[PDB]
């Protein structure tokens, strides 16, 4: 009854190009099974949100990564909100939430806005700059670091970390195997970084430590608290704003519709987030024998969501390939869905708001006038290199 395929989603070639295949994942059947890895696929957009909003059954403390928690040892601690279910999840997720909260937004909002326009100004003076190098990687090292109060030294394990994290959640493959060998010295950096004392008053790490005091977490729990921050939310925004330009420099009517109306940013990089998807893919562990479309999948199962394949899916989405930037993007997964919906994404769209807002006051064209170069994760979709010309407005 379930259909058998041999699609290796974790494939480099998948990789460079995984249109093809999501559809034909999708036009299988609400349910696959992937023969290359023994796991189920869900790639439309009803069964990926359907999943993600039945948490009691399609479990996340078993891992987030093919790895089922209940077989093998997890390759670092679990983390006590993306790996936790409720209720122990809810006190950790509540001060997550409080940490990134709306009020914390105000107080962040004008220097990341003025670090955004400083950063597009200083391109300006250049021309010819790598998207990624230089505007993707650059702006987030620039604010985000800062704002979590960690110390200067050893920054330059925090990209590294967070691509080891999000290849540890892939299958036990090449590129799985690279990043958590002699990944230590990564681990040790930011294990220290989360330590109390390291973090400067006032920033997120800081803050989550001072839940302590309220029962909400106790003083062990926010180290990995700390942690979360550190894997989930730097090289996630990288992605994000990195998909947000390359659609730009590929869709030059929507940036001129941009610029026409820079308020169009926040729903800019909403879409941008949808269209290219930046998590790709996270695993759920069955609790229980559950029915999913139309198959019987038993107790214990790995069940994989294809995020961005979801957000394509033309039962769902019009023109799902294109880029609009005035679509009705609300009801994407590309933050997920559900109990663990992003709890970063006030500060994700707050970075990818206000960049593309310097981009649309600053900016009258964005070309592509150089190789452009694919980097592989097993769960994030982004470029290596994006070598762009910005003309000035
Ligand atoms: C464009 C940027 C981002 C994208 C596309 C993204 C995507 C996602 C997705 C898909 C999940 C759901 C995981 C699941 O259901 O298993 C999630 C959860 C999470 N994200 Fe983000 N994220 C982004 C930015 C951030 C930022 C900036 C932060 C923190 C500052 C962050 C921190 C977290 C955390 C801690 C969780 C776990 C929440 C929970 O399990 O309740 N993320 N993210
Ligand atoms: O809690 C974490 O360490 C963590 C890591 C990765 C994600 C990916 O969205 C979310 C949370
Ligand atoms: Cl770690
Ligand atoms: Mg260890
Ligand atoms: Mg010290």
Known sequence: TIPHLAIDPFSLDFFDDPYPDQQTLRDAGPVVYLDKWNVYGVARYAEVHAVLNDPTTFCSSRGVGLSDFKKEKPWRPPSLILEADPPAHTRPRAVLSKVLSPATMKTIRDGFAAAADAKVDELLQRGCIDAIADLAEAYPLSVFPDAM?????????????????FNAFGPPNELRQTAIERSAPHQAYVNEQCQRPNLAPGGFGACIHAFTDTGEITPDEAPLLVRSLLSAGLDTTVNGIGAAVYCLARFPGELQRLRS??????????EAVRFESPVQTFFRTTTREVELGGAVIGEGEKVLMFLGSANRDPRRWSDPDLYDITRKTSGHVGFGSGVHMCVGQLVARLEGEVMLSALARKVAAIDIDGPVKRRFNNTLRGLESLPVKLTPA
Not at 261 to 270: G, Q, S, V
């Open 149 to 165: 109060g960690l110390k200067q030294e050893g920054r330059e394990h925090l990209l590294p970390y967070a691509g080891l994290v």
């Open 261 to 270: 109306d820079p308020t169009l940013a926040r729903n800019a990089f909403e």
